[PDB]
Write an enzyme that holds these catalytic residues in place. Structure first.
Site, short mmCIF file in Angstrom:
data_model
loop_
_atom_site.label_atom_id
_atom_site.label_comp_id
_atom_site.label_asym_id
_atom_site.label_seq_id
_atom_site.Cartn_x
_atom_site.Cartn_y
_atom_site.Cartn_z
N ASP A 1 0.52 -0.98 -0.09
CA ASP A 1 -0.01 -0.06 -0.02
C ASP A 1 0.94 1.98 -0.13
O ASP A 1 2.21 1.47 0.05
CB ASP A 1 -0.93 0.02 1.65
CG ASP A 1 -0.35 -0.40 2.55
OD1 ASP A 1 0.64 0.29 2.49
OD2 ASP A 1 -0.90 -0.11 3.13
C1 XLN Z 1 -10.08 8.81 12.45
C2 XLN Z 1 -9.29 8.18 11.92
S1 XLN Z 1 -7.79 7.52 11.98
O1 XLN Z 1 -8.18 8.17 11.28
O2 XLN Z 1 -7.20 7.57 13.04
C3 XLN Z 1 -7.48 5.41 11.26
C4 XLN Z 1 -6.76 5.56 12.84
C5 XLN Z 1 -5.23 4.82 11.80
N1 XLN Z 1 -5.47 4.99 10.53
C6 XLN Z 1 -5.36 3.98 10.01
O3 XLN Z 1 -5.44 3.34 10.69
C7 XLN Z 1 -4.58 3.41 8.76
C8 XLN Z 1 -4.13 2.77 8.59
N2 XLN Z 1 -4.14 2.18 6.60
C9 XLN Z 1 -3.18 2.10 6.60
O4 XLN Z 1 -2.48 2.41 6.36
C10 XLN Z 1 -4.31 2.35 4.97
O5 XLN Z 1 -4.73 1.52 4.21
C11 XLN Z 1 -3.04 3.18 3.49
C12 XLN Z 1 -2.02 2.10 3.51
C13 XLN Z 1 -2.20 4.17 5.08
C14 XLN Z 1 -3.60 3.55 2.82
O6 XLN Z 1 -2.55 3.83 1.99
P1 XLN Z 1 -2.39 4.22 0.07
O7 XLN Z 1 -4.00 2.64 0.08
O8 XLN Z 1 -3.38 5.77 0.14
C15 XLN Z 1 -9.61 9.95 11.56
C16 XLN Z 1 -9.70 11.16 11.49
C17 XLN Z 1 -8.27 12.21 11.39
#
Ligand code: XLN
Ligand code: XLN
Ligand code: XLN
Ligand code: XLN
Ligand code: XLN
Ligand code: XLN
Lengths: 145, 76, 144, 146, 146, 144, 146, 77, 75, 72, 70, 73
Positions: B36
């Site tokens: 990703d």
């Molecule tokens: C609300 C919640 S949050 O943004 O804080 C979500 C909590 C942390 N975020 C994640 O868990 C993101 C993890 N997932 C990923 O890594 C994405 O799929 C990625 C790989 C980053 C996408 O990358 P590319 O596909 O764009 C939000 C409050 C602001």
């Protein structure tokens, strides 16, 4: 100067109580920057939990407020969230907490776009209170799923 | 000595949870190994820590395959 | 050795709704600590961050890890005497890799790196079902 | 100026979450006036209940904020609260709501002492945002033990 | 292999919301037969600031509510979902015993097994376990009506 | 009269917001029975979660309310709670919910002492609204 | 009679938790007066903040409750709140707090219309507990589109 | 080839984001250089890790100028 | 007689068939009773056999035979 | 034109008709007076006549006649 | 047998065996709501391991009818 | 007398200095009128001078002079 009141913010961001942390938008330029305001009041719920008796605004919530500000900037620069799209905090880097923020303070945030590559966007955030830098960070947010 | 290719493939397998046998020289991170958007960033930073260097953004955008990383580390 | 929530209450000053360590599974003074945060849908922020799609906010993973380092510090260098604060000073290299959802049991491992003049650098990793969901380098300070 | 931050206010007022409504004290002259600040943020709990979707600070909470400011002024002028002592609203007169207060607003309250008799004290309050008056009231507050 | 339900499906099946939604996940189930669910016990839940402050213990009546919601999920999956004008009521409890205290950090596994159902009223036996040890067991009756 | 206002109740019970469910005690005879009042208002927190839109008092909270009344009666009959002492809900028998309780209702709870052995005490409870029985249950509570 | 349960109150008033302060309507006559009941419980959120340890219902919330009761009477007398229409607290004139309201009390509020002009309504409010007057005020509420 | 105080000046320039010309032997971290109370500690730690030397807390309080850092590093004390 | 009633009470309390309840099988070890089943069953014996069992006396009743012996003793 | 104003003040403060405010009427017993109506009424008399009323002196004003006499 | 049926009725509707007569109706006489009748259909069925259709169960409102169906 | 009290009321109710309240100041035009300050002001006059003003009579009060004139009747 392109201000946004709380109704426009409610239309742009999905966050609601108790995790909506942007009270006003002072200015913004599409794809470049956004300046927003967080009013810090003692009547906020986390203040009964983080060090009860010595109320100090938690730094991780400063980072979340900057992330919501970049969320507004992105929805204004690119489209708002299409069905299925989410806006994620992907990473934080080079973050420093320099001065404690207390109730009564008005924290002015400036978030500025740096680089973009397919939905992944790097921002620079700086938070000020009364002309003193209180926090600075590099953030990266992604739009996906 | 450990070849630059040994080191690079080691890092890519650890970062992307892929078997070291499957990481070929022309493998794209995104398509072939299914990485990703943030796996690329972590992967470049892992290379930076491994060879004690700093990779500017203009060059980092070019590292999208295993061969590109090896090439970058050893001169055009 | 383990620490239940009563011992945690005696060590950390945080209270509802901002106490984010439910248990301590093991720890070694001056080296590491393993703690548990149970993620339930019955937590207050879930009605506010994206109502309808409950996902644990990443900054709250960071706060839970910082509180875990706080427990480790109080056990390694001594408890908070009255008039001392334990501050979040900096964050480096934080990555949110996998979303954490209700029903997940988040296991945090914080590892002590260095200390100098009340500033302490830690590395934290949070896992769910053995897969890394978050990792960060944090700096916390004790002062005043 | 004689400012008071949130720690000193907490030591003077017994109110706590979610009914503590004075964030800072900017100035005061004993026995005359007090100027305080209430920061209005969208992250306050009543905003999820009073007109959900149209956040506007309720006027009765502006009144309570002014009353708490009069409490600080009184504690600094006559003496702090003894343990078994209460500070309570006895009456309200001439309350006028002129402008809605919204999230992002910094509401400055100025309370002025008028008269006191038998432990009952009259204050006049003005609440302003950006120099424009949003609220004004006359209050009567009493202190008594048990 | 296994038939899980995530929190999104639970939100579509149960109408309960914060702070009275008490089922975090469904591990397995066989329609009209049994359902195994998971409640994570965290200190960041609101009732812990009120019931015995200082000694957090999950209230037993909330274990019973959690079992009732697990049974609600099982019922909505086996028979139709809740139509407009349908309520899901706790009708009665028999032979409920609380055997072990549940504390923060515990992951309470609930298993509800349907015994008999006629005219929309359903009797089930519920068992709640922590680390394979039984903490609660009850026989309950829930009815759906209008 | 043996009435108890909310201040005496706070002195007797450790329960606090949001889980204290006894607003007043109308009468009691030590070791025999106790009559208490729970006022049901829409401004209570659980109403925003249990069937949002259809406010109905949860039955498990009726049981907890009666259990708290039995706590009051026991502390008045046998002695107040010492520090190293808990008051546990041990069990429920033959609990019936007969009529729904809605906001605006003033629920009268009457608990009567039946039997005691060791630390266990069995009570019989009935809850009424406007003179109609809304609930009845048999409870067992244990001390420390 | 003309009683109203909480479901119809929810359909009439836009207020929600924690700021809905009318539990039931016992009676009303269109264009004249309305009798409502607010049940005071210790399980309400503000009691943990306003004088913790001495639960007493805040007087400004008595005022808000009377204002919500007039809102019900007005919506039943002139028509419900249309989309984009707000109901504003315009003024207070002689509110007197005569007796403290405590948990366990059932507060009966009676609002009586005096005059109405251009959507602004002057009413007189009386709050009673056990037949004793606990609060009385004269207030004015307005209906407006922006 | 080899280098001596050059490494200390290099580290100070990297930590406080200043061009190496601004790093003078007589530069104070706080006043002359744009350093807050927290960059100083980060800088002492950065020095400590680079020269694998131990700087006690009481010793670290004295390193407030470039010269003081170079002097402490010379001889690990 | 007295053994049918004692055995019925114990079998009902610990959900076991009358066949599995022998006279000298202990409630805790053999039949699986928990700290709360022992108390409920003592109260049940008291309710069936209109006799009262002191706390220490209840402490000694761990088998069917022990209950029958107490009941025959304190007639 | 003293007692006209004094009775005017009493009628305004205690919501009673001027016919019911006689020279010999007590505030508490005859008229309806809150413990707070007496205080408001003393403050109103002072505000109208710009005079100072001591606490011991103000406690003695319990009738209309006492108020008028203190004024004169 | 009916001794067992009367035992079941007394336990289900919390009444002493002295008050449950052969010709006593469940709804009014022993004060049973919509759930005591169903609970008792379930308890009778489970006791005499028998299956009672609802239309057949609907007619059983007195002790007399209950044993007669039994 | 009566004009002292009327001008006092008009000044307090509307946030204007007593100097700006002349006999012929229009509430809407000269002084600061919100959508309903005129109604608020008539009600204020009514509560101070214990008079009752019918709706058609109340609709006529748009200036200071009109208010002073009504208080004479
Ligand atoms: C609300 C919640 S949050 O943004 O804080 C979500 C909590 C942390 N975020 C994640 O868990 C993101 C993890 N997932 C990923 O890594 C994405 O799929 C990625 C790989 C980053 C996408 O990358 P590319 O596909 O764009 C939000 C409050 C602001
Ligand atoms: C509660 C809150 S928090 O951890 O989030 C702290 C909020 C942000 N932290 C700070 O404000 C740190 C500010 N920095 C300081 O003021 C320190 O004293 C510094 C600047 C680091 C020292 O400078 P020098 O003068 O010693 C706790 C959560 C665990
Ligand atoms: C939310 C609340 S609750 O259902 O758990 C609490 C409601 C408890 N009260 C009741 O169940 C009311 C009892 N009503 C009846 O059972 C009536 O007898 C019925 C059977 C409905 C009508 O009888 P008959 O006249 O048809 C839900 C959480 C899961
Ligand atoms: C607050 C909560 S609660 O008491 O209602 C919830 C507690 C649920 N009940 C229990 O935790 C009891 C479980 N433990 C036991 O059963 C005791 O340890 C027993 C076994 C009874 C002791 O007997 P034996 O082991 O000596 C309180 C509100 C009132
Ligand atoms: C929620 C809040 S509230 O009713 O208490 C409103 C808070 C106080 N009210 C005001 O701020 C009124 C402000 N006044 C005005 O905006 C104008 O004078 C109005 C009355 C709107 C006339 O405008 P015109 O354009 O029609 C609800 C409590 C029930
Ligand atoms: C919290 C809120 S509050 O200030 O709003 C309380 C409001 C309730 N106010 C009262 O109960 C006023 C009661 N009034 C009195 O009893 C006075 O002492 C009076 C009536 C003036 C007696 O007069 P006299 O005997 O001196 C704060 C709660 C403490």
């Amino acid at each position: 100067t392109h201000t946004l009141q709380i109704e426009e913010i409610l239309e742009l961001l999905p966050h609601r109580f108790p995790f909506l942390l942007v009270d006003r938008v002072l200015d913004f330029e599409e794809g470049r920057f956004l300046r927003a305001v967080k009013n810090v009041s003692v009547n906020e719920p986390f203040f009964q939990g983080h060090f009860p008796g010595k109320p100090i605004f938690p730094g991780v919530l400063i980072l979340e407020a900057m992330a919501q500000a970049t969320g507004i900037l992105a929805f204004k620069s690119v489209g708002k969230l299409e069905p299925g799209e989410l806006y994620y905090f992907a990473g934080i880097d080079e973050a420093r907490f320099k001065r404690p923020v207390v109730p009564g303070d008005q924290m002015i945030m400036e978030v500025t776009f740096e680089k973009t590559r397919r939905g992944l966007t790097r921002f620079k955030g700086v938070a000020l209170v009364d002309g003193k830098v209180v926090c600075e960070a590099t953030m990266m947010c992604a739009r996906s799923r | 000595a450990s070849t630059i290719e040994e080191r690079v493939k080691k890092i890519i397998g650890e970062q992307l949870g892929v078997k070291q046998e499957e990481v070929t020289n022309n493998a794209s991170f995104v398509e072939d190994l299914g990485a990703d958007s943030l796996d690329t960033v972590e992967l470049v930073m892992a290379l930076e820590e491994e060879f004690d260097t700093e990779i500017p953004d203009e060059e980092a955008e070019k590292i999208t395959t295993v061969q590109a990383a090896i090439d970058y580390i050893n001169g055009h």
